[PDB]
Design an enzyme around this catalytic site. Sequence first.
Site, PDB file in Angstrom:
ATOM      1  N   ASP A  65      61.059  59.977  50.884  1.00 18.80           N
ATOM      2  CA  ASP A  65      61.040  61.174  51.894  1.00 18.80           C
ATOM      3  C   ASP A  65      62.522  60.910  52.930  1.00 18.80           C
ATOM      4  O   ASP A  65      62.912  60.083  53.582  1.00 18.80           O
ATOM      5  CB  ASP A  65      60.112  61.226  52.814  1.00 18.80           C
ATOM      6  N   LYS A 104      64.674  67.941  53.482  1.00 19.31           N
ATOM      7  CA  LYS A 104      64.603  69.123  54.557  1.00 19.31           C
ATOM      8  C   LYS A 104      65.727  69.610  54.845  1.00 19.31           C
ATOM      9  O   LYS A 104      66.778  69.114  55.084  1.00 19.31           O
ATOM     10  CB  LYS A 104      63.682  68.346  55.490  1.00 19.31           C
ATOM     11  N   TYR A 117      68.594  63.089  59.204  1.00 15.81           N
ATOM     12  CA  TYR A 117      68.597  61.574  59.379  1.00 15.81           C
ATOM     13  C   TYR A 117      69.895  60.833  59.130  1.00 15.81           C
ATOM     14  O   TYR A 117      70.083  59.648  59.380  1.00 15.81           O
ATOM     15  CB  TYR A 117      67.630  60.734  58.286  1.00 15.81           C
ATOM     16  N   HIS A 153      62.369  71.947  57.543  1.00 15.91           N
ATOM     17  CA  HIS A 153      62.002  70.626  58.396  1.00 15.91           C
ATOM     18  C   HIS A 153      60.947  71.044  59.792  1.00 15.91           C
ATOM     19  O   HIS A 153      60.225  70.448  59.946  1.00 15.91           O
ATOM     20  CB  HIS A 153      63.351  69.909  58.797  1.00 15.91           C
TER      21      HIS A 153
HETATM   22  N1  LIG Z   1      58.835  66.022  58.786  1.00 20.49           N
HETATM   23  C1  LIG Z   1      59.042  65.457  60.244  1.00 20.49           C
HETATM   24  O1  LIG Z   1      59.423  65.984  61.167  1.00 20.49           O
HETATM   25  C2  LIG Z   1      58.943  63.998  60.187  1.00 20.49           C
HETATM   26  C3  LIG Z   1      58.886  63.499  61.666  1.00 20.49           C
HETATM   27  C4  LIG Z   1      58.670  61.923  61.576  1.00 20.49           C
HETATM   28  C5  LIG Z   1      58.730  61.419  60.368  1.00 20.49           C
HETATM   29  N2  LIG Z   1      59.023  61.840  59.140  1.00 20.49           N
HETATM   30  C6  LIG Z   1      58.957  61.084  58.025  1.00 20.49           C
HETATM   31  O2  LIG Z   1      57.857  60.077  57.856  1.00 20.49           O
HETATM   32  C7  LIG Z   1      58.630  58.744  57.757  1.00 20.49           C
HETATM   33  C8  LIG Z   1      57.611  57.793  58.515  1.00 20.49           C
HETATM   34  O3  LIG Z   1      57.544  58.106  60.041  1.00 20.49           O
HETATM   35  P1  LIG Z   1      58.148  57.118  60.931  1.00 20.49           P
HETATM   36  O4  LIG Z   1      59.377  56.623  60.544  1.00 20.49           O
HETATM   37  O5  LIG Z   1      58.216  58.013  62.334  1.00 20.49           O
HETATM   38  O6  LIG Z   1      57.196  55.886  61.312  1.00 20.49           O
HETATM   39  P2  LIG Z   1      56.044  54.947  60.598  1.00 20.49           P
HETATM   40  O7  LIG Z   1      56.241  55.002  59.208  1.00 20.49           O
HETATM   41  O8  LIG Z   1      54.695  55.365  61.396  1.00 20.49           O
HETATM   42  O9  LIG Z   1      56.569  53.564  61.371  1.00 20.49           O
HETATM   43  C9  LIG Z   1      57.685  52.861  61.126  1.00 20.49           C
HETATM   44  C10 LIG Z   1      57.881  51.580  61.906  1.00 20.49           C
HETATM   45  O10 LIG Z   1      56.734  50.827  61.331  1.00 20.49           O
HETATM   46  C11 LIG Z   1      57.372  49.572  61.210  1.00 20.49           C
HETATM   47  N3  LIG Z   1      56.428  49.314  59.871  1.00 20.49           N
HETATM   48  C12 LIG Z   1      56.577  49.553  58.811  1.00 20.49           C
HETATM   49  N4  LIG Z   1      55.603  48.808  58.070  1.00 20.49           N
HETATM   50  C13 LIG Z   1      55.006  47.908  58.858  1.00 20.49           C
HETATM   51  C14 LIG Z   1      54.067  46.857  58.583  1.00 20.49           C
HETATM   52  N5  LIG Z   1      53.694  46.734  57.266  1.00 20.49           N
HETATM   53  N6  LIG Z   1      53.766  46.113  59.628  1.00 20.49           N
HETATM   54  C15 LIG Z   1      54.436  46.260  60.788  1.00 20.49           C
HETATM   55  N7  LIG Z   1      55.210  47.182  61.108  1.00 20.49           N
HETATM   56  C16 LIG Z   1      55.759  47.919  60.214  1.00 20.49           C
HETATM   57  C17 LIG Z   1      58.852  49.823  60.797  1.00 20.49           C
HETATM   58  O11 LIG Z   1      59.600  48.600  60.964  1.00 20.49           O
HETATM   59  P3  LIG Z   1      60.641  48.205  60.015  1.00 20.49           P
HETATM   60  O12 LIG Z   1      61.360  49.392  59.486  1.00 20.49           O
HETATM   61  O13 LIG Z   1      61.738  47.303  60.937  1.00 20.49           O
HETATM   62  O14 LIG Z   1      60.146  47.076  58.975  1.00 20.49           O
HETATM   63  C18 LIG Z   1      59.261  50.968  61.852  1.00 20.49           C
HETATM   64  O15 LIG Z   1      59.496  50.251  63.071  1.00 20.49           O
HETATM   65  C19 LIG Z   1      59.725  58.864  58.492  1.00 20.49           C
HETATM   66  O16 LIG Z   1      60.540  57.636  58.262  1.00 20.49           O
HETATM   67  C20 LIG Z   1      60.321  60.089  57.883  1.00 20.49           C
HETATM   68  O17 LIG Z   1      60.531  59.960  56.487  1.00 20.49           O
HETATM   69  C21 LIG Z   1      58.866  63.091  59.032  1.00 20.49           C
HETATM   70  C1  LIG Z   2      60.425  64.929  68.265  1.00 20.59           C
HETATM   71  C2  LIG Z   2      61.070  65.610  67.742  1.00 20.59           C
HETATM   72  C3  LIG Z   2      61.959  66.471  66.623  1.00 20.59           C
HETATM   73  N1  LIG Z   2      62.633  65.750  65.921  1.00 20.59           N
HETATM   74  C4  LIG Z   2      63.840  65.112  66.372  1.00 20.59           C
HETATM   75  O1  LIG Z   2      64.082  65.099  67.620  1.00 20.59           O
HETATM   76  C5  LIG Z   2      64.461  64.191  65.395  1.00 20.59           C
HETATM   77  C6  LIG Z   2      65.994  64.376  65.210  1.00 20.59           C
HETATM   78  C7  LIG Z   2      66.835  63.620  64.725  1.00 20.59           C
HETATM   79  C8  LIG Z   2      66.317  62.892  63.578  1.00 20.59           C
HETATM   80  F1  LIG Z   2      67.227  62.234  62.761  1.00 20.59           F
HETATM   81  C9  LIG Z   2      64.846  62.842  63.466  1.00 20.59           C
HETATM   82  C10 LIG Z   2      64.312  63.374  64.465  1.00 20.59           C
HETATM   83  O2  LIG Z   2      62.730  63.350  64.401  1.00 20.59           O
HETATM   84  C11 LIG Z   2      62.167  63.091  63.259  1.00 20.59           C
HETATM   85  C12 LIG Z   2      62.182  64.432  62.435  1.00 20.59           C
HETATM   86  O3  LIG Z   2      62.241  65.428  62.970  1.00 20.59           O
HETATM   87  O4  LIG Z   2      62.206  64.207  61.207  1.00 20.59           O
END
Ligand SMILES: NC(=O)c1ccc[n+]([C@@H]2O[C@H](COP(=O)([O-])OP(=O)(O)OC[C@H]3O[C@@H](n4cnc5c(N)ncnc54)[C@H](OP(=O)(O)O)[C@@H]3O)[C@@H](O)[C@H]2O)c1
Ligand SMILES: C#CCNC(=O)c1ccc(F)cc1OCC(=O)O
EC number: 1.1.1.21
Length: 316
Positions: free
Chosen positions: A44, A78, A49, A111
């Site tokens: 993803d 996105k 990003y 997005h």
């Molecule tokens: N569409 C949107 O608006 C939107 C918004 C938010 C997120 N997203 C997508 O969803 C993905 C996931 O969400 P997120 O990045 O917000 O957070 P998340 O996946 O809920 O959590 C990521 C965090 O958890 C830690 N972590 C991962 N695996 C772990 C484990 N096994 N044990 C303990 N800690 C662990 C990571 O640390 P380390 O990396 O240091 O290991 C990092 O600090 C994003 O990266 C993005 O691709 C999309």
């Molecule tokens: C809260 C909220 C809305 N999103 C942000 O402000 C944002 C901005 C930049 C970025 F890289 C990720 C971001 O948040 C994660 C995402 O939108 O996928």
Amino acid sequence: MASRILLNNGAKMPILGLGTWKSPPGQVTEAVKVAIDVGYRHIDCAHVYQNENEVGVAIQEKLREQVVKREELFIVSKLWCTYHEKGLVKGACQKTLSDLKLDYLDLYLIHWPTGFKPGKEFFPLDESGNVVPSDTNILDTWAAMEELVDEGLVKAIGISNFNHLQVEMILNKPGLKYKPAVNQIECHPYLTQEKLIQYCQSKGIVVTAYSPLGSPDRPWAKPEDPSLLEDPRIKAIAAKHNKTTAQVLIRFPMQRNLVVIPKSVTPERIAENFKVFDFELSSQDMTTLLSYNRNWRVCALLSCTSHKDYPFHEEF
Ligand SMILES: NC(=O)c1ccc[n+]([C@@H]2O[C@H](COP(=O)([O-])OP(=O)(O)OC[C@H]3O[C@@H](n4cnc5c(N)ncnc54)[C@H](OP(=O)(O)O)[C@@H]3O)[C@@H](O)[C@H]2O)c1
Ligand SMILES: C#CCNC(=O)c1ccc(F)cc1OCC(=O)O
């Protein structure tokens, strides 16, 4: 638990993918390489990003090494809010394709439903700090997304952070050509999303759960916020199953027929997080996890609460 879910475009999408928001550019190439080595087939991504070039280096290296074939990968990106304009959508998609080293995306998402003034800044502000909107609506942006399918740039299109009325608006679009394949939304035990999930699934739209671990690295985290990974109730369920808390948090959405995209740049965790196809949460476990809902959001888009298309005023 099968590894892929069938989309309404006829393609299959891996239910477990690697998130890349906040993955530093100097670490994400290794993260994606390790992920592919240990079984991940879905990444993803997003232009906003600021690390798609580095994600692409990893994908390309694994394709070149013949670790995987392109048809076995499912790459998602996105369209950022400053590109909602008809004349900007293709170029935005093409920039993402060029960075990711791909000739097509498996899935391209709007997005956020909110369009912003185009320009260099991802969040254009007025002199008072409010986001400056675009006048382009959801439906015209959707038409531009449909064109990408018809030009071969993307195999599927979808939406992200759309509320049910916004999903309904697209489904009711005059002359709708392609239904959204996916709505990617925040989902975890503190934001369980029963109403929106039911609605989307009833329309044949697959839901992807983001921030499934509660995004402990979110930049605006505060000490007093709730913490899924530290919740003793969730730790107890993990202990009962001899799994980690993260593994329970990843398995949870899988059993709701969701796709889930945990982020890590830590090689051991990347591997750990994938080892979730070897155990089952009971119905009782599932209902217990659902009971922890508190409507708590990692991503609330707080600079856009006056935007006409702000998604989170509605109950769902
Ligand atoms: N569409 C949107 O608006 C939107 C918004 C938010 C997120 N997203 C997508 O969803 C993905 C996931 O969400 P997120 O990045 O917000 O957070 P998340 O996946 O809920 O959590 C990521 C965090 O958890 C830690 N972590 C991962 N695996 C772990 C484990 N096994 N044990 C303990 N800690 C662990 C990571 O640390 P380390 O990396 O240091 O290991 C990092 O600090 C994003 O990266 C993005 O691709 C999309
Ligand atoms: C809260 C909220 C809305 N999103 C942000 O402000 C944002 C901005 C930049 C970025 F890289 C990720 C971001 O948040 C994660 C995402 O939108 O996928």
